[PDB]
Design a protein around this ligand. Structure first.
Ligand SMILES: Nc1ncnc2c1ncn2[C@@H]1O[C@H](COP(=O)(O)OP(=O)(O)O)[C@@H](O)[C@H]1O
Ligand SMILES: Nc1ncnc2c1ncn2[C@@H]1O[C@H](COP(=O)(O)OP(=O)(O)O)[C@@H](O)[C@H]1O
Ligand SMILES: Nc1ncnc2c1ncn2[C@@H]1O[C@H](COP(=O)(O)OP(=O)(O)O)[C@@H](O)[C@H]1O
Lengths: 566, 24, 505
């Protein structure tokens, strides 16, 4: 291969340009085991993007120049081969085939070339298609005879879509699994890469930072992979140190990770133990009133996270029973923003539309050949995208029996089988079920007799199966809100729009007489404290638009509104 | 109940040979 | 050698040759973070076309010469590289390959060169790709071309770090214009007021929707300053009046360039007849805005049309529903109408649900569509012995959850049909055909009896008033089409439909 489409990794390892490859030695030995074969000496590094597939080959190219190769791979000039640059420039017939036969002629003359084709899935249909002169069919004769040594690097998905699907190419290539490193393996990688990133940034990097880079990237980043994600934290923190300047620490990694996810450095640089020690006071910030509920779930999460925890249970299962919209999904959002630092972790499934077991095949995915195969079965993109999550099952009493027979897995194990065959882990997810099985007192202070908390408890036993209810951690019951409890919610929500008023130098001069009437109008004992915000926008914000209807802007108008008494 | 997933065949062809203009 | 190919942006920053990049200090800081890295140390400035991504590198070169650059980037000569010039020369073919290699051999001969490539996708689809292996390079593509070319190569993503250059706000592009004021004041010898720049930023976002914030606003300032230099040849103060004159030639709309406009209530009812109280109800709701959430949210079709005409100019600014992506990217100042939401199940509650909470839909298409200036409208509704008045609003509360009905701006009701209201719809639909008779020099007058008959037939409130368009043409126009062909009525004739059966002269 010329130095036109690739790069001599063997000559890069002579000049000490390749990064040290710590670990992955079972894989470098496996690649040598494939390359030492007589025929079809062609390994494929199958992994994920960033697990160190190129690093295995960089570690192999170091093992060639250090003489650690078994007199079949000695003095093999290992070249990469960018097939993307090799396709690039083919707008005419025969351009790609000419640039590939020049490479293939160069390997024939020298006889000591090992190709490394990153993205070997590109080989299929690189020229035109499968049955056509592509890069696959050009290389297939010499790959089948061991006369072209080629290290591939696909992912597991791309190996199955392109190499296993292509008949007469799955045989030419030998799968070498490069798994994602563990966190303790990644710390050993970072400590081996310590001298490279200390010398580049001229910034000392401590052992506290490299443990923090591997641990927090596995937790907070779940679209990328360990080796890379954690190196990128070490690399970006050393780079942002250069734009501040001598030492990268635990807190410096949490800052450059907080700029990616949006978690405040504090929620990254914390300590589960303290992290959940002042849990109650931070969950009061968006739940005022119904305080025994907050202290119950704050106690339950601190039991089922801190200290002992089996890995065969979720972080907490909850039944939120009681009156609707009094803080039911408002607490679960407040728990999700406490969970690891992101409010965007709450998922409403809205089980009220389900009154069918056939629609459970439209919730957990369809059997293939049926409708509901793409949307439905979307739990892959949600909960194994985010192992730290909160799933809310609103109105579970509306659903069919067969729907939560499939939910008996996730309370026992913490795993779920998708309709497309995925392991959708509910392992760290706080699952929360929800039923307004209580509406009797709710429906006026009368009942079925001739004349609270335990009325809705035995309605769960009446409606559901006891097999489902007892795996659930704690059942939380909400009560009717006192008028002193409602006006604090009015106080919290009138202050939300008040910040948008002084942006325009307007001021809603607050009075408590209007706040009592908002509590009367924005609450009923069937639905209340959910339509309180529409009561705010219909009764306050309609009449504050009458200011600019009669054109009141000025430097600022101190408006005070009070509607009549009821 | 069933859905058939069809298969939208794309038009894919090899690159065009060109004819050259000569400059002596 | 770089001495005859591509502009030295660092040398241009020393001479003040680059236009001053006012703002963008966060994105230039981000680019200095990438160039300081060991791996993935090559920024790809993802933006939109004309977003200011070349100005980040122009602003980077100005940050190099000030000494506000890191110790790994002190006195780096930052070169843009002119593609299409390393062509300029034929010895013979392979020239652009052989000449580009001579440029790169001078880059590693020196050590202080950072290439900027304004179109990095054009070198992907020597190719330089190889030389990238170990020459720091800043790229600049769109997000469509990042997902098409740069991210689709693992040998081009282990080194190419995406850097977002976003479209500025209307506020942020004013200080871009105020920083670029002295360049365009001195180029046309005409002073440009601050008001003009507040106008040229606001009006360019509002009315130019294929171009992006920074450029669009600069295009109005540059062309209004150019217009002032022309008409003084056929001190002169480019104003906000001047920007609307120039943008009135860009878009071709009459100059009505808003709270005063918003004072509708009567500034309408050209197509809306009847339904009077819902029109007064959507006045104070739209003017709650005067955030990232749409300008209005409501839970009639004509109402929308006339709402699209009065708020957003065009009758065809009403989008009746990717399926709403890359067609509100085209026009983000549209009323998005949802026809018959009752007949759709819960899979549609992700492009109307997270847009009242974000206003943005990231998707697989490749752009984040902007819903902050739309008017979302849902179109839902069209036992024993006894002895809507004001209520329809409780139906949709029971239909779908009020967990975002307090996030809907206003749930307005529509009032019942009036017998006089339908008569006012009959003489509205006769205007569609009276104009077709004035093209024949005919006149179509009607009587109160004939207009009440057409009001009496085909008005059914289950179907709204759709049956009325049929009733006009089955009864008038089918019998008026024959009498023209029978030549009972010719040109220069007054047609008086009276009387039951319709007869006339
Ligand atoms: N065992 C290892 N030792 C040192 N660095 C490693 C190791 N595995 C991966 N890396 C580094 O992590 C990143 C992984 O990218 P790369 O090697 O291209 O793998 P992949 O092809 O799977 O993305 C590189 O920066 C690489 O140097
Ligand atoms: N932050 C900014 N400060 C000053 N001028 C800017 C800024 N952003 C854009 N511009 C100007 O707006 C125009 C945008 O051009 P350019 O930055 O090359 O666009 P693009 O990034 O889309 O290629 C130029 O006139 C540029 O100088
Ligand atoms: N004020 C009005 N309300 C409703 N329909 C009207 C009104 N004025 C005229 N129409 C006519 O009645 C018909 C309404 O049907 P459609 O377009 O489905 O809208 P909608 O029934 O929601 O008003 C159209 O032919 C429209 O032109």
């Amino acid at each position: 291969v010329l130095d036109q489409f690739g790069r001599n990794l063997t000559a890069a390892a002579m000049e000490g340009k390749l990064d040290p490859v710590i670990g992955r030695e079972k894989e470098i030995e496996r690649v040598m085991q494939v390359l030492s074969r007589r025929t079809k000496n062609n390994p494929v590094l199958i992994g994920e993007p960033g697990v160190g597939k190129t690093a295995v080959v960089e570690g192999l190219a170091q093992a060639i120049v250090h003489g650690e190769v078994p007199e079949t791979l000695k003095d093999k000039q290992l070249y990469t081969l960018d097939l993307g640059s090799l396709v690039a420039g083919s707008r005419y017939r025969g351009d790609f085939e000419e640039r590939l036969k020049k490479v293939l002629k160069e390997i024939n003359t020298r006889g000591d070339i090992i190709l490394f084709i990153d993205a070997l899935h590109t080989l299929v249909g690189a020229g035109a298609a499968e049955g056509a002169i592509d890069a696959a069919s050009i290389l297939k004769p010499k790959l089948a005879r061991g006369e072209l040594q080629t290290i591939g690097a696909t992912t597991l998905d791309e190996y199955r879509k392109y190499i296993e699907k292509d008949a007469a190419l799955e045989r030419r290539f030998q799968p070498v699994q490069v798994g994602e490193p563990t966190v303790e393996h990644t710390i050993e990688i970072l400590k081996g890469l310590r001298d490279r990133y200390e010398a580049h940034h001229r910034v000392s990097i401590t052992d506290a930072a490299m443990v923090a880079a591997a641990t927090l990237a596995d937790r907070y980043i779940n679209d990328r992979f360990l080796p890379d994600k954690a190196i990128d934290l070490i690399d970006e923190a050393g780079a942002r140190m250069r734009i501040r300047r001598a030492e990268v620490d635990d807190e410096q990694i949490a800052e450059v990770l907080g700029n990616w996810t949006g978690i405040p450095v504090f929620k990254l640089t914390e300590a589960e133990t303290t992290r959940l020690l002042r849990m109650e006071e931070e969950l009061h910030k968006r739940i005022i009133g119904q305080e025994d509920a907050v202290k119950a779930v704050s106690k339950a999460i601190r039991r089922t996270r801190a200290g002992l925890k089996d890995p065969k249970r979720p972080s907490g299962s909850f039944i939120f029973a009681g009156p609707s919209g009094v803080g039911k999904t408002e607490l679960s959002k407040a728990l999700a923003n406490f969970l690891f630092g992101d409010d965007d972790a709450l998922i409403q499934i809205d089980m009220g539309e389900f009154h069918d077991r056939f629609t459970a095949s439209r919730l957990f995915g369809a059997p293939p050949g049926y409708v509901g195969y793409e949307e439905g079965g979307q739990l892959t993109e949600k909960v194994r995208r985010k192992p730290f999550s909160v799933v809310l099952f609103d109105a579970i009493e509306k659903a069919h029996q067969e729907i939560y027979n499939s939910l008996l897995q996730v309370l026992e194990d913490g795993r779920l089988t998708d309709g497309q065959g995925r392991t959708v882990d509910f392992k760290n997810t706080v699952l929360i079920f929800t039923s307004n099985l209580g509406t009797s007192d709710i429906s006026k202070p009368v009942g079925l007799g001739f004349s609270m908390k335990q009325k809705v408890n035995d309605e769960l036993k009446k409606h559901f199966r006891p097999e489902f209810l007892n795996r659930i951690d704690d059942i939380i019951v909400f009560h009717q809100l006192t008028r002193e409890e409602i006006i604090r919610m009015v106080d919290l929500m009138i202050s939300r729009v008040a910040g948008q008023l002084k942006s325009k130098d307007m001021a809603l001069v607050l009075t408590d007489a209007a706040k009592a009437l908002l509590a009367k109008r924005g609450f009923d004992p069937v639905l209340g404290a959910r339509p309180l915000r529409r009561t705010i926008q219909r009764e306050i914000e309609d009449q504050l638009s009458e200011k600019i209807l009669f054109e009141e802007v000025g430097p600022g108008q101190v408006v005070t509104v009070d509607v009549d008494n009821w | 109940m069933k859905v058939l997933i069809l298969a939208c065949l794309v038009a894919l062809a090899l690159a065009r040979e060109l004819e050259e203009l000569n400059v002596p």
